[PDB]
Design a protein around this ligand. Structure first.
Ligand code: FMN
Ligand code: F3S
Length: 1475
C-alpha cells in the first residue's frame, strides 16, 4: 500500500489540495495491486473534510437552509444496486439515524462514471449515495460525531458487500473504491469538481492478496489509512473482545456501549479491526495521536532520546500493563477532522517522508517526491524514525514527535507517581512421567545449562509427525511455530534485541478507557520468584492439574472440573491461578495422571473467556512437563502469563549435583559452572529462545505473543482444538481428549508400574536401532551410494528400507486411484524429458565443500536441469565451460574434481538472493538462467542463514567478501522486503537487471502461504517454490528443525488451490521440495500441484554423505560439508553418480505414469482426484486423519491451460530502455567512451541505471569496463536508485531519492544533492531513504542529507559520506568505509564485523546510542585515520559542495576532536585505527 496526508493550515480550503491528493495516489500505483482483469484495483481512497461548498448545491435545489459546519454531518453510503433491496437498505439507515434523536434532511446521489471501472469492479459496484443529517436539539462537533459514531456502528451490524457506510461524520468524509489509483477521480466526479476543497486529505492505495475486490475493503477507513500487517491479530482481537462487556466511561450509557457491541471481529481485516479499535479510543475522549500510542506504542526502553522526557517513559510503563501492542509493520495515517497525522510501528518498517513549507504547508507519504511543491521554499524535509508521529491541529500548528507525546504525558499523569505507589532419585522417574526422555536432557537441558544457548544441529527433521509416530510424544509436539514470510518481516533478535521484552504483567487488566492510578521481568520464574509472587498482590489458588484413578474416570472429566474450579475460583476473587502438577507437595502413581500443562492452560484460558472473565485474573503455570524452549512458547501462546518450570530447574540441579558431572568439571567440561551459573545459564538460554521464536514472526513483546496463538496444530482434532485451543488451524484433524489422555499414560506407565535407572532413548535427534524411524539412516544411504557408483542390489536394500518404514508424512496415508487403463513404458515420455524438471536445490558454498558443490552443478548441467548456488556467492571461474579436460577425467581449471567431460560446466543455473546478499554481484546476477529470492528455508523459517566461523575459510571469506575468521549469521529479514510491495520491488530490480532471467520466490509451507503466494503471483514473480519442514541444513537450532514450518503436502496444495481460485495459477510455476527422494515422491508432488521438484539431502547422499550429522562441525568424514582440506581430499564422488541417481528417480517416474495411464507428467499435475485414502494404514494414536485439505482441489481434468506460462515476466517500458537506446551502445561497445546524459525522473522511475549496469556487466563482467557514462538526473527518484552500479558509471541526483539507494552497488559513484533552489540546511534535512548500500560490494556514494534506517546495512566494501542517519547504522557491515556528519539514531553498530566507520556526534551522546556487543568506540588517534577520514570528507566536497562538509574541512583541527571512530575487533590492528 501507499499512504500519506496533505495539510493546509494557513489558507482556507482550496481545490489544489484535493488535486494534489489525487496526483499523489497516482505515484502510489506500484505500491498497489490489481484483480484478474489486470485493471480493477485492490483499492484507492481519500479522506477529506466535508466539501461543504459542493453540498451547497444540493440544499439550494431543495430550497433548504444549510446547517452550520459543525452541525451538518454526512454519510457516504454503499447500497444494494437492486431497487427493492436498496430501499430496504435506505430505510434501515434512516431507521437507525432516527433512533438517536437525529433528523434526515435527505439523500444526495453521488455523480459517478462506472464506465472507467474494470469489468470485475464494475460488476461488484455498490450504489453510492450520501445521506445528510442534523440534530434538532442542537448537537455539534463532538456530540454529533459521538452520535453518528454510534449510528454507523449499529448500521454496521448488517454489514455486507452491498451495504456499508464508508463514513458518517460532520467533520470528515471518504471517497474510496475498487479503482486503480489515477482512476479514483475519474470515477468519483465530485473529486474533479472545483467546488471540492479541503484543508487536508488522507490518501491510500491498497495492495491485496486476492483477485476478488470488495468495495468496503478499500481503505482510508472511517478514521485511518493503515499500511502494514498486524502480525499479532488473533491475540489483539481476543484481548480486545474480552473487554467488551465491562466497558465503562464518563456518561457513555451502558446501553450505548452495548451498542458498539462487537467492536472487533476475527473475520475482518487487521485494518478494519485496527480502525475500529482506534475509533473507540477516540470517541471515548482521547485524540487519535494518544490512542495510537496506547495500541502501537514506541519501543521506549534504552532510548537516550527520552532523557528529557521521563513523562512519556512513564506513560508507556503504565499502559504497557494495560494493553498489548498491535505488532507488525505499520504506517498509520489518521484524521479526526480536528487533528491529522501519522506515526510508525515500534520498529519503523514502512517509509514515511514529510515535507514542510514556510507556510507550514505539510506533505507526508510513503514516498519522497510525490506532491510537487516549489522547492525554493521547503523549510524542513524529514521522516519518521521508528516510533515517531507527526501531526496537525486545526488551530494552525504542526506537532513533531516530541511535544506530542508530552501532551498525554502531561495529563492523567500519575505516571511516575501512581507507578511507584502500586534428595532421592525419584527425579529420575518424575522425569519419565512428565515425558522427559534420555535425549531431552542430554541433548537439550544440558547444553542449555552448560553453554547457555539452546543446542545447534544439522540436517532436516527426518522422523515422522507426532500424530503418525509410534513413539510417545508430548502435546507440545503437535504444534509447529508459524513465522513471517512475505507479507511481513522477521526481526533480528540478537542484533535488534534492544527493541524487544519478555516483561509480563501479573495484575488484572482493568479499564483501558479510564486512566485510573488505581510485573515479571521474564516469563520464567524460579522457586524464589514463585514464593515471592505467592505473597504478591493477590493470593493465588492452586488448581490441581492432577487427578486420581478410576471413578472420575477420564481426562475429559478432570479437564471439565479444572475449568469449573478455575471459573469458580476466579469468580470468588482469585487474581492469579497457579495451575500445578505438584499440588500440596507431591506427585504419585495414584495422582495417576496429569492435565498436560498446554492442554490445561488452553482450557482455563478459553473457558474463562467464554465466562467473560479473562480480564479478571492472570495465569501462572507451575509445571514439570516443560523444559524446551518451544515448550515455554506454546504456554505463553495459549494463555500462561508466566511459567515456573520447577522440574526442568530440578533436572539442572541433579545434573550439576552429580559425581560424573562434578568430575568432568575438574577437567573436560567447563568447571566454570557453580550451580548458580548452571541455572542462570539455563534460564538465560530459555530467554534467548523466546526472543528468537517471537522474532520469527516479527514480534517484539512476549506481551503481544501472549494471547496470540502463533502456531498451526497438526493431528489435533475438531473438538480437542475447540475445547483447548480455539481458533488454531488443524487441517488434518486427529487427537481426541481420550487420545491425548492415552498418550500421557504411555509414559506414566514407565516411572511407576515398572523400574527406573535411565530415561529411555528414542532415536529422535539421531538414528538408533531401538528408536524413532528416520528416512535418512547411515545404512539406507551407503546402500544408495554404492548403487549410483556402479551404473541394483543396493536398490533392493535401498528401496527396502523405504518400504520398511512406518507412516512418516501425509503422502504416506495416500495411494493411487487410476481413472484410465494401464499403459506401456514405451508410450511414456523419456527419462531425458522428466529430468529437466529436477532441481538440486540451494546449499551454500560455505556449507558444502567446493568439491561437493561444483559436482552437483556439473551433473545437473549435464542433464539439462538446474542446480543452485545457495547463499554463498559463486566463484567467477565457474561461469566458463571447460576445455582443459583430459583423458583421465581431470582438468586444470578445477583440479579437485574428478570424472569431468569436456562439455562440462560448474556454473549454477539458479542464483540465490538471500538476506545476506553474500555474493550478490552484477555479473553474479547475470550468469544465471533464474534468480531465487530465498524468503525462508524449511529447516528454520523465521531465522536467517548461519555459517560458523570455523567454516569461513579464506576462500569463503573471499567469495563472501567478509572476514576470514568470523562467524556469519545473516539477517532474518531481507532488509529489502518488509511487505508485499517491497517484494514486488525486489523482483522488479531483478527483472530490471536481467530481463531475460526468471525470478523465483522461495517460501516454506505453513498456514497462510496460499494467501502469500497469491500476492507473490501478483508481485510479478516467475516461479514460487514451497519448501517443507523436511528440508536440510548445514546448521540450525534443533528446536527449529523439530518445530518450525508445516509439511509441503499442506504447502503445495494450498498454494495450488488459492492460485487457481484467484485465477493466478497460470502466472507462476510451482516447485516443491522437502524430503523428496523417489519417483513416487515426485508423482505425489505432481498430483498435488507441483511442476518441478527439488532435492537436497539425497543429491548430497548420492555424492557420498553418510548421515554422520555433524555438518555444523566442519568434520564431514567424507568431504561434503567441510572446508578442511584434509577431509575434502577424502571426497569420492563424480558428476556421473548424481547424474545416474536422477535417472533412476526418473525411470521410476515413468513406471508410475504407466500404472496411472498417462503419457507425460504434464498430463498428471493437479489431478488430485487420482488420490484415495489408503486401506492398510492404522495409526497408534487416533482412529484417522481428515484429508480434505489434500483431496478437495479444483477439478483439473479439463481446465489445463494454467500449465502454459509466459517465458519471462517483463518490467514494462522503463526509463533505462531509452537510456540504452541512443549513442550509448557506443560508449559501451567501444569499450572506452565518455557519455553524459540528463533526464527528469519521477518516482515511478525505479532502479535507475541498474539495467545499464547489467548491460555493461554482461559484456565485461564487473571490472572489464573503462568507459565513463555519466547520468545526471533531476527530481524525486524511485526505490533502488543506482542499484548494482558498475565501475565506469556515475550517477547524479539533483533532488532527493527514496529507499535502497545503491542497493547492491559494485563500483563507481553516486552523488546526491538537494536542488540549488533550496534555502534549508542540507545536513539538517533528509535526502535518502532506508537500506541504502544494501550489501554493497564496492563503489562510492556521497549525499548532503540525512539517510533513513539501516544505512549501509550489509556493506561489504562500499564507501560513503552522508550527513546523518536513522537507527541501525552500518548494521551487519563487514568492510568498506562509512563517514557520517550529523546525528544518528540508536543501535549504531549491531553485528558490524569489519570495515571502519567514522561518525561525528557533537551532542556528544553517541556512546549511549552505539551497539556494544562488538564494535568499539575510539577517538581518531592514528594519523592515517585522519588521512583516510579527510580525503573522504574532502572527496564529498569535491563531488558535492557540502556546507557542513566545507565547515569541518576549513576548521579541520577542531571538529576532529571528540568525534568517534568505530572499530570492529578485526580492524583493531591496521594503519588506521592503530599508530
Ligand atoms: C546442508 C544443507 C545446506 C543448505 N543450505 C541452504 C541455503 O544455503 N539456502 C537455502 O535456501 N536452502 C539451503 N538448504 C535447503 C535446500 O535449499 C533444499 O531446500 C532442501 O535441501 C530440500 O530438502 P531435502 O534435503 O529434504 O531434499 C540447505 C540444505 C542442506 C542439506
Ligand atoms: S549428516 Fe552432515 S555431518 Fe556430514 S554426514 Fe551428512 S554431511
Amino acid at each position: 500500500c501507499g499512504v500519506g496526508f496533505i495539510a493546509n493550515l494557513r489558507g482556507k480550503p482550496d481545490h489544489t489540495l484535493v488535486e494534489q491528493a489525487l496526483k499523489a495516489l497516482g505515484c502510489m500505483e506500484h505500491r498497489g495491486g490489481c484483480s484478474a482483469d489486470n485493471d480493477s484495483g485492490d483499492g484507492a481512497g481519500v479522506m477529506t473534510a466535508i466539501p461543504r461548498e459542493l453540498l451547497a448545491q444540493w440544499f439550494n435545489t431543495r430550497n433548504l437552509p444549510m446547517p452550520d459546519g459543525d452541525r451538518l454531518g454526512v454519510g457516504m453510503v454503499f447500497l444494494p444496486q437492486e431497487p427493492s433491496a436498496r430501499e430496504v437498505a435506505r430505510a434501515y439507515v434512516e431507521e437507525v439515524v432516527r433512533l438517536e434523536k437525529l433528523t434526515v434532511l435527505g439523500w444526495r446521489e453521488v455523480p459517478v462514471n462506472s464506465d472507467v471501472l474494470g469489468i470485475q469492479a464494475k460488476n461488484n459496484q455498490p450504489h453510492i449515495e450520501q445521506i445528510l443529517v442534523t440534530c434538532p436539539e442542537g448537537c455539534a462537533g463532538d456530540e454529533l460525531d459521538r452520535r453518528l459514531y454510534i449510528a454507523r456502528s449499529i448500521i454496521g451490524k448488517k454489514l455486507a458487500e452491498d451495504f456499508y457506510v464508508c463514513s458518517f461524520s460532520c467533520r470528515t468524509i471518504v471517497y474510496k473504491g475498487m479503482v486503480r489509483s489515477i482512476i479514483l477521480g475519474e470515477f468519483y466526479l465530485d473529486l474533479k469538481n472545483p467546488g471540492y476543497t479541503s484543508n487536508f486529505a488522507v490518501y491510500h492505495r491498497r495492495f491485496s492478496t486476492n483477485t476478488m475486490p470488495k468495495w468496503p475493503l478499500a481503505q482510508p477507513m472511517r478514521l485511518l489509512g493503515h499500511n502494514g500487517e498486524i502480525n499479532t491479530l488473533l491475540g489483539n482481537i481476543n484481548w480486545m473482545a474480552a473487554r467488551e462487556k465491562e466497558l465503562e466511561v464518563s456518561g457513555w450509557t451502558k446501553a450505548e456501549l452495548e451498542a458498539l457491541t462487537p467492536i472487533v471481529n476475527q473475520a475482518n481485516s487487521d485494518s478494519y479491526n485496527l480502525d475500529s479499535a482506534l475509533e473507540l479510543l477516540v470517541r471515548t475522549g482521547r485524540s487519535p495521536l494518544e490512542a495510537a500510542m496506547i495500541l502501537v506504542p514506541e519501543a521506549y526502553k534504552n532510548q537516550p532520546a527520552l532523557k528529557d522526557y521521563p513523562e512519556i517513559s512513564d506513560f508507556h510503563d503504565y499502559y504497557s500493563g494495560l494493553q498489548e501492542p498491535w505488532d507488525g509493520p505499520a504506517l498509520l495515517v489518521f484524521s479526526d477532522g480536528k487533528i491529522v497525522g501519522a506515526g510508525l510501528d515500534r520498529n519503523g518498517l514502512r517509509p514515511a517522508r514529510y515535507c514542510i513549507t514556510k507556510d507550514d504547508y505539510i506533505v507526508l507519504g510513503s514516498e519522497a517526491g510525490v506532491v510537487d511543491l516549489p522547492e525554493v521554499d521547503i523549510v524542513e524535509k524529514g521522516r519518521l524514525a521508528p516510533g515517531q508521529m507527526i501531526a496537525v491541529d486545526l488551530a494552525e500548528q504542526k506537532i513533531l514527535k516530541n511535544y506530542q507525546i508530552k501532551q498525554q504525558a502531561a495529563q492523567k499523569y500519575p505516571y511516575g507517581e501512581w507507578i511507584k505507589i502500586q534428595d532421592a532419585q525419584t527425579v529420575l522417574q518424575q522425569q519419565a512421567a512428565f515425558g522427559y526422555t534420555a535425549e531431552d536432557v542430554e541433548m537439550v537441558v544440558v547444553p542449555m545449562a552448560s553453554q547457555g544457548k539452546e543446542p545447534t544441529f544439522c540436517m532436516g527433521d527426518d522422523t515422522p509427525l507426532a500424530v503418525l509416530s509410534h513413539k510417545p510424544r508430548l502435546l507440545y509436539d503437535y504444534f509447529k511455530q508459524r513465522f513471517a514470510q512475505v507479507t511481513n518481516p522477521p526481526i533480528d533478535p540478537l542484533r535488534e534485541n534492544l527493541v524487544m521484552s519478555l516483561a509480563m504483567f501479573l495484575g488484572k487488566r482493568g479499564n483501558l478507557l479510564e486512566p485510573k492510578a488505581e510485573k515479571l521481568r521474564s516469563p520464567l520464574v524460579n522457586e524464589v520468584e514463585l514464593q515471592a509472587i505467592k505473597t504478591g498482590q493477590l493470593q493465588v489458588a492452586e488448581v490441581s492439574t492432577l487427578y486420581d484413578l478410576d471413578g472420575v474416570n477420564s481426562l475429559e472429566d478432570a479437564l471439565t472440573n479444572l475449568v469449573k474450579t478455575a471459573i469458580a475460583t476466579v469468580q470468588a476473587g482469585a487474581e492469579i491461578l497457579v495451575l500445578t502438577d505438584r499440588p500440596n507437595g507431591a506427585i504419585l502413581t495414584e495422582n495417576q495422571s496429569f492435565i498436560p500443562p498446554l492442554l490445561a492452560v488452553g482450557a482455563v484460558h478459553h473457558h474463562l473467556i467464554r465466562a467473560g472473565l479473562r480480564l479478571k485474573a492472570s495465569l501462572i503455570v507451575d509445571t514439570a512437563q516443560c523444559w524446551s524452549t518451544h515448550h515455554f512458547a506454546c504456554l505463553v501462546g495459549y494463555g500462561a502469563s508466566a511459567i515456573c518450570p520447577y522440574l526442568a530447574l530440578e533436572s539442572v540441579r541433579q545434573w550439576w549435583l552429580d559425581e560424573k558431572t562434578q568430575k568432568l568439571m575438574e577437567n573436560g567440561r567447563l568447571d566454570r559452572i557453580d550451580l548458580p551459573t548452571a541455572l542462570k545459564n539455563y534460564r538465560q538460554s530459555v530467554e534467548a529462545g523466546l526472543f528468537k521464536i517471537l522474532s520469527k514472526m516479527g514480534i517484539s513483546l512476549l506481551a503481544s505473543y501472549h494471547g496470540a496463538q502463533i502456531f498451526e496444530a497438526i493431528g489435533l482434532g475438531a473438538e480437542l482444538v475447540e475445547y483447548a485451543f480455539a481458533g488454531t488451524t488443524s487441517r488434518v484433524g486427529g487427537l481426541t481428549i481420550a487420545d491425548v489422555a492415552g498418550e500421557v499414560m504411555v509414559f506414566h506407565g514407565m516411572a511407576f508400574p515398572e523400574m527406573a535407572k535411565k530415561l529411555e532413548n528414542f532415536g529422535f535427534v539421531n538414528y538408533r536401532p531401538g528408536g524413532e524411524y528416520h528416512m535418512n539412516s547411515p545404512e539406507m544411504s551407503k546402500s544408495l551410494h554404492k548403487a549410483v557408483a556402479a551404473y541394483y542390489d543396493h536398490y533392493e536394500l535401498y528401496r527396502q528400507y523405504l518400504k520398511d518404514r512406518p507412516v512418516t508424512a501425509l503422502r504416506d496415508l495416500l495411494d493411487f486411484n487410476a481413472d484410465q487403463p494401464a499403459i506401456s513404458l514405451e508410450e511414456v515420455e523419456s527419462v531425458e524429458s522428466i529430468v529437466k524438471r529436477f532441481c538440486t536445490g540451494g546449499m551454500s558454498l560455505g556449507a558444502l565443500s567446493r568439491e561437493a558443490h561444483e559436482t552437483l552443478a556439473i551433473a545437473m548441467n549435464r542433464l539439462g536441469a538446474k542446480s543452485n548456488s545457495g547463499e554463498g556467492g559463486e566463484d567467477v571461474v565457474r561461469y566458463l565451460t571447460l576445455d582443459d579436460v583430459d583423458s583421465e577425467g581431470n582438468s586444470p581449471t578445477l583440479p579437485h574434481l574428478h570424472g569431468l567431460q569436456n562439455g562440462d560446466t560448474a556454473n549454477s543455473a539458479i542464483k540465490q538472493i538471500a538476506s545476506g546478499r553474500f555474493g550478490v554481484t552484477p555479473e553474479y546476477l547475470m550468469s544465471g538462467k533464474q534468480l531465487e529470492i530465498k524468503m525462508a528455508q524449511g529447516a528454520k523459517p523465521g531465522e536467517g542463514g548461519q555459517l560458523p566461523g570455523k567454516k569461513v575459510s579464506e576462500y569463503i571469506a573471499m567469495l563472501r567478501r567478509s572476514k576470514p575468521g568470523v562467524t556469519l549469521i545473516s539477517p532474518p529479514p531481507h532488509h529489502d522486503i518488509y511487505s508485499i510491495e517491497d517484494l514486488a520491488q525486489l523482483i522488479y530490480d531483478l527483472h530490471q537487471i536481467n530481463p531475460e532471467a526468471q525470478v523465483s520466490v522461495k517460501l516454506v509451507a505453513e498456514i497462510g502461504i496460499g494467501t502469500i503466494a497469491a500476492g507473490v503471483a501478483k508481485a510479478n514473480a516467475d516461479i514460487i517454490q514451497i519448501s517443507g519442514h523436511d528440508g536440510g541444513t548445514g546448521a540450525s537450532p534443533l528446536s527449529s528443525i523439530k518445530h518450525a514450518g508445516s509439511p509441503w503436502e499442506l504447502g503445495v496444495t494450498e498454494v495450488h488451490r488459492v492460485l487457481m481460485e484467484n485465477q493466478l495459477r497460470d502466472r507462476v510455476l510451482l516447485r516443491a521440495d522437502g524430503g523428496l527422494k523417489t519417483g513416487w515422491d515426485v508423482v505425489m508432488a505432481a498430483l498435488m500441484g507441483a511442476e518441478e521438484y527439488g532435492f537436497g539431502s539425497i543429491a548430497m547422499i548420492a555424492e557420498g554423505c553418510i548421515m554422520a550429522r555433524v555438518c555444523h562441525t566442519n568434520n564431514c568424514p567424507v568431504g561434503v560439508a567441510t572446508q578442511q582440506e584434509r577431509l575434502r581430499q577424502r571426497f569420492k564422488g563424480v558428476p556421473g553418480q548424481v547424474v545416474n541417481f536422477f535417472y533412476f528417480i526418473a525411470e521410476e517416474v515413468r513406471s508410475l505414469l504407466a500404472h496411472l495411464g498417462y503419457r507425460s507428467l504434464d498430463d498428471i499435475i493437479g489431478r488430485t482426484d487420482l488420490l484415495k485414502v489408503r486401506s492398510d494404514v492404522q495409526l497408534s494414536k487416533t482412529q484417522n486423519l481428515t484429508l480434505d485439505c489434500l483431496l478437495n482441489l479444483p477439478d483439473t481434468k479439463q481446465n489445463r491451460q494454467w500449465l502454459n506460462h509466459e517465458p519471462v515476466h517483463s518490467n514494462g517500458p522503463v526509463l533505462d530502455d531509452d537510456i540504452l537506446a541512443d549513442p550509448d551502445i557506443q560508449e559501451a561497445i567501444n569499450h572506452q567512451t565518455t557519455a553524459t546524459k540528463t533526464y527528469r525522473l519521477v518516482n515511478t522511475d525505479r532502479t535507475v541505471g541498474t539495467r545499464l549496469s547489467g548491460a555493461i556487466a554482461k559484456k565485461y563482467g564487473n571490472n572489464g569496463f573503462e568507459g565513463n557514462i555519466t547520468l545526471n538526473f533531476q527530481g524525486a527518484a524511485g526505490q533502488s536508485f543506482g542499484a548494482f552500479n558498475l565501475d565506469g558509471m556515475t550517477l547524479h541526483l539533483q533532488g532527493e531519492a527514496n529507499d535502497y539507494v545503491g542497493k547492491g552497488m559494485n563500483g563507481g559513484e553516486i552523488v546526491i544533492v538537494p536542488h540549488p533552489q533550496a534555502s534549508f540546511a542540507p545536513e539538517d534535512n533528509v535526502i535518502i531513504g532506508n537500506t541504502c548500500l544494501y550489501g554493497a560490494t564496492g563503489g562510492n556514494l556521497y549525499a548532503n542529507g540525512r539517510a533513513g534506517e539501516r544505512f549501509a546495512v550489509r556493506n561489504s566494501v562500499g564507501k560513503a559520506v552522508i550527513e546523518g542517519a536513522g537507527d541501525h547504522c552500518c548494521e551487519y557491515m563487514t568492510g568498506g568505509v562509512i563517514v557520517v556528519l550529523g546525528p544518528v539514531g540508536r543501535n549504531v553498530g549491531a553485528g558490524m564485523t569489519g570495515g571502519l566507520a567514522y561518525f561525528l556526534d557533537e551532542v556528544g551522546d553517541l556512546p549511549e546510542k552505539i551497539n556494544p556487543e562488538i564494535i568499539t568506540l575510539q577517538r581518531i588517534t592514528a594519523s592515517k585515520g585522519e588521512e583516510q577520514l579527510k580525503s573522504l570528507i574532502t572527496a564529498h566536497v569535491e563531488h558535492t559542495g557540502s556546507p557542513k562538509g566545507k565547515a569541518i574541512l576549513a576548521n579541520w583541527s577542531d571538529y576532529l576532536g571528540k568525534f568517534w571512530q568505530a572499530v570492529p575487533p578485526s580492524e583493531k590492528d591496521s594503519p588506521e585505527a592503530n599508530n
